[PDB]
Amino acid sequence: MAEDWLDCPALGPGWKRREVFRKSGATCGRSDTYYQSPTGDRIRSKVELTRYLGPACDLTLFDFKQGILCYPAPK
C-alpha cells in the first residue's frame, strides 16, 4: 500500500519525497514527483509546497524530478 515514499533530501526530514514513472519506463520516461507533508497535505506544484511549508523550505530552483535545488548567492 504505497509507492516509493523515501526520505526527502532536498528539504530534509518530515517531508516525504515519492517519485513516479521513474523506475519502469524508457531511459527518458518522464518521472513525476509528488511530496507528502507531515500533516497530510500533498503538493505537486513544487513551489506550491514551498510556500506551504513556509520560509523553512524552498524549491524555487528545486527540480521537481531530480530532487535537487541550487541557489547562486541568495541576495
Curated annotation (Swiss-Prot):
PTM statement from Swiss-Prot or TrEMBL: Sumoylated, sumoylation may increase interaction with ATF7IP.
Phenotype when changing S45A: Reduces binding to methylated DNA
Occurrences of domain MBD (ranges): 1-69
Induction summary: Up-regulated by interferon.
Consequence recorded when altering Y52A: No loss of binding to methylated DNA
Result when mutating R22 to A/K: Abolishes binding to methylated DNA
Tissue expression pattern: Widely expressed.
Localization in the cell: Nucleus; Nucleus matrix; Nucleus speckle; Chromosome
Domain of life, source organism: Eukaryota
Domain notes: The methyl-CpG-binding domain (MBD) functions both in binding to methylated DNA and in protein interactions. The third CXXC-type zinc finger mediates binding to DNA containing unmethylated CpG dinucleotides.
Role this protein plays: Transcriptional repressor that binds CpG islands in promoters where the DNA is methylated at position 5 of cytosine within CpG dinucleotides. Binding is abolished by the presence of 7-mG that is produced by DNA damage by methylmethanesulfonate (MMS). Acts as transcriptional repressor and plays a role in gene silencing by recruiting ATF7IP, which in turn recruits factors such as the histone methyltransferase SETDB1. Probably forms a complex with SETDB1 and ATF7IP that represses transcription and couples DNA methylation and histone 'Lys-9' trimethylation.
Subunit comment: Interacts with OASL, ATF7IP, ATF7IP2 and BAHD1. Binds CHAF1A and the SUV39H1-CBX5 complex via the MBD domain. Binds MGP via the TRD domain. May be part of the MeCP1 complex.
Official protein name in the record: Methyl-CpG-binding domain protein 1
Species per Swiss-Prot/TrEMBL record: Homo sapiens
Lineage: Eukaryota, Metazoa, Chordata, Craniata, Vertebrata
Gene expressing this chain: MBD1
Whole sequence portion shown: 1 to 75 of 605
